[PDB]
Scaffold this active site. Sequence first.
Site, PDB file in Angstrom:
ATOM      1  N   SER A 146     -71.557  34.929 -15.008  1.00 19.43           N
ATOM      2  CA  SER A 146     -70.353  35.306 -15.747  1.00 19.43           C
ATOM      3  C   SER A 146     -69.922  34.205 -16.729  1.00 19.43           C
ATOM      4  O   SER A 146     -70.581  33.993 -17.739  1.00 19.43           O
ATOM      5  CB  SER A 146     -69.276  35.754 -14.760  1.00 19.43           C
ATOM      6  OG  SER A 146     -68.034  35.105 -14.983  1.00 19.43           O
ATOM      7  N   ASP A 240     -70.146  47.482 -15.869  1.00 16.39           N
ATOM      8  CA  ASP A 240     -69.624  46.154 -16.134  1.00 16.39           C
ATOM      9  C   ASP A 240     -69.285  46.062 -17.620  1.00 16.39           C
ATOM     10  O   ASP A 240     -70.123  46.397 -18.451  1.00 16.39           O
ATOM     11  CB  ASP A 240     -70.654  45.095 -15.734  1.00 16.39           C
ATOM     12  CG  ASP A 240     -70.236  43.666 -16.037  1.00 16.39           C
ATOM     13  OD1 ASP A 240     -69.095  43.487 -16.497  1.00 16.39           O
ATOM     14  OD2 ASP A 240     -71.048  42.744 -15.796  1.00 16.39           O
ATOM     15  N   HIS A 270     -69.711  43.963 -11.816  1.00 11.73           N
ATOM     16  CA  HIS A 270     -69.696  42.566 -12.194  1.00 11.73           C
ATOM     17  C   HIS A 270     -69.328  41.731 -10.972  1.00 11.73           C
ATOM     18  O   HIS A 270     -68.407  42.078 -10.240  1.00 11.73           O
ATOM     19  CB  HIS A 270     -68.697  42.370 -13.339  1.00 11.73           C
ATOM     20  CG  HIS A 270     -68.712  41.025 -13.982  1.00 11.73           C
ATOM     21  ND1 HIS A 270     -69.437  40.772 -15.124  1.00 11.73           N
ATOM     22  CD2 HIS A 270     -68.117  39.874 -13.651  1.00 11.73           C
ATOM     23  CE1 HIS A 270     -69.260  39.508 -15.469  1.00 11.73           C
ATOM     24  NE2 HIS A 270     -68.456  38.949 -14.597  1.00 11.73           N
TER      25      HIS A 270
HETATM   26  C1  LIG Z   1     -67.356  35.089  -9.371  1.00  7.62           C
HETATM   27  C2  LIG Z   1     -67.823  35.498 -10.767  1.00  7.62           C
HETATM   28  C3  LIG Z   1     -66.987  36.608 -11.413  1.00  7.62           C
HETATM   29  C4  LIG Z   1     -65.607  36.154 -11.922  1.00  7.62           C
HETATM   30  C5  LIG Z   1     -65.001  36.915 -13.127  1.00  7.62           C
HETATM   31  C6  LIG Z   1     -63.546  37.315 -12.811  1.00  7.62           C
HETATM   32  C7  LIG Z   1     -63.389  38.433 -11.786  1.00  7.62           C
HETATM   33  C8  LIG Z   1     -65.175  36.129 -14.447  1.00  7.62           C
HETATM   34  O1  LIG Z   1     -66.391  36.532 -15.152  1.00  7.62           O
HETATM   35  C9  LIG Z   1     -66.497  36.578 -16.506  1.00  7.62           C
HETATM   36  O2  LIG Z   1     -67.562  36.669 -17.065  1.00  7.62           O
HETATM   37  C10 LIG Z   1     -65.187  36.629 -17.232  1.00  7.62           C
HETATM   38  C11 LIG Z   1     -64.205  37.430 -16.658  1.00  7.62           C
HETATM   39  C12 LIG Z   1     -62.950  37.551 -17.216  1.00  7.62           C
HETATM   40  C13 LIG Z   1     -62.661  36.899 -18.385  1.00  7.62           C
HETATM   41  C14 LIG Z   1     -63.619  36.121 -18.984  1.00  7.62           C
HETATM   42  C15 LIG Z   1     -64.897  35.990 -18.449  1.00  7.62           C
HETATM   43  C16 LIG Z   1     -65.799  35.096 -19.244  1.00  7.62           C
HETATM   44  O3  LIG Z   1     -66.558  34.300 -18.747  1.00  7.62           O
HETATM   45  O4  LIG Z   1     -65.570  35.156 -20.579  1.00  7.62           O
HETATM   46  C17 LIG Z   1     -65.065  36.361 -21.227  1.00  7.62           C
HETATM   47  C18 LIG Z   1     -64.051  36.035 -22.327  1.00  7.62           C
HETATM   48  C19 LIG Z   1     -63.614  37.295 -23.103  1.00  7.62           C
HETATM   49  C20 LIG Z   1     -62.553  37.058 -24.174  1.00  7.62           C
HETATM   50  C21 LIG Z   1     -62.819  35.268 -21.824  1.00  7.62           C
HETATM   51  C22 LIG Z   1     -62.770  33.767 -22.109  1.00  7.62           C
HETATM   52  C23 LIG Z   1     -62.722  33.482 -23.608  1.00  7.62           C
HETATM   53  C24 LIG Z   1     -62.871  32.021 -23.976  1.00  7.62           C
END
Ligand SMILES: CCCC[C@@H](CC)COC(=O)c1ccccc1C(=O)OC[C@@H](CC)CCCC
Length: 296
Positions: A146, A240, A270
């Site tokens: 992620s 996802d 996800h």
């Molecule tokens: C245990 C692993 C899962 C955890 C999961 C939450 C449940 C997070 O996984 C993600 O990939 C993620 C989820 C929400 C927000 C962001 C992300 C991510 O990395 O970047 C997406 C961008 C979009 C604008 C935001 C930051 C922008 C600088």
Amino acid sequence: MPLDPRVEQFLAQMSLAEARQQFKQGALLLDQMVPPPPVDTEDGTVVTTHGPVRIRRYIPDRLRFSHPLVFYHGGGFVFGDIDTHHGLVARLCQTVGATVISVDYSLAPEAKFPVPVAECIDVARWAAHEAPGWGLKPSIVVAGDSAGGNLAAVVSQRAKDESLPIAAQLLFYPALDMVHETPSKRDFARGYLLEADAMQWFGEQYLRTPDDVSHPWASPALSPDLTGLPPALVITAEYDPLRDEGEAYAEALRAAGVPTEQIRFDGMIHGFMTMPIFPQMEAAIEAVARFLERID
Ligand SMILES: CCCC[C@@H](CC)COC(=O)c1ccccc1C(=O)OC[C@@H](CC)CCCC
Ligand SMILES: CCCC[C@@H](CC)COC(=O)c1ccccc1C(=O)OC[C@@H](CC)CCCC
């Protein structure tokens, strides 16, 4: 292609410091529901350009793989630690039979973009240097889930300039494009564990200003030249929001002559590779093992 029944049931039935514990508490619950394999670990700290970063080196019973893994955990840049992702790294270590350094990179918003990207490079570069001392190839394998998949992806794209040898990148349902809306994003924006409102928020905690979205250390999907990047295992979940940017980016690597294996786990959501109640978690950890055999 419908939901996995086990995932279906999971969805059916449900301050910064506070939400963090809550998320730690959610992880450790799962770790009791499905005990991790025991493994030898060392705690340690790497001197990075943005301060000390705590790490944990995992050591398999049998060492079979020739390069160290460097794991950057998920949690949206705001949550997670080494303990949160103990379950996955443990398995990666033992199933793959490799050394994994799990990185405790600095979290947001108390550290802002692009501080952790810097930390992750320094640690990778540290592992490259240490690798001969462990009896391994200097090249390393970056890995993450992620937000951690994002870092893995960014570390790989900076690797050449930073004189850091990377032999492969493992991307588990990564975030790669903060600029573009995509069918999956849009279509799976609410109700599949990772939600759009969470994603907007995470990007407010992590970024300095909204213009950072089009920066390639934030959105590695936007880099126009992917030739000669390390071999890539890109694993995505079906239902996802981040699925589509993950798969396109894999198609792009493939078109740029980068050895790529892309795998969609049908019916999954996800975060599934830190959710060991699903059989698909260990099915993917098996995919990591198989892929890595082909790197030599
Ligand atoms: C245990 C692993 C899962 C955890 C999961 C939450 C449940 C997070 O996984 C993600 O990939 C993620 C989820 C929400 C927000 C962001 C992300 C991510 O990395 O970047 C997406 C961008 C979009 C604008 C935001 C930051 C922008 C600088
Ligand atoms: C190859 C890169 C994908 C990334 C994406 C963002 C640029 C582009 O997607 C498309 O071009 C697309 C357009 C219309 C209909 C489908 C697709 C598509 O991806 O089909 C995926 C199919 C099974 C193979 C889903 C079935 C299960 C829910």
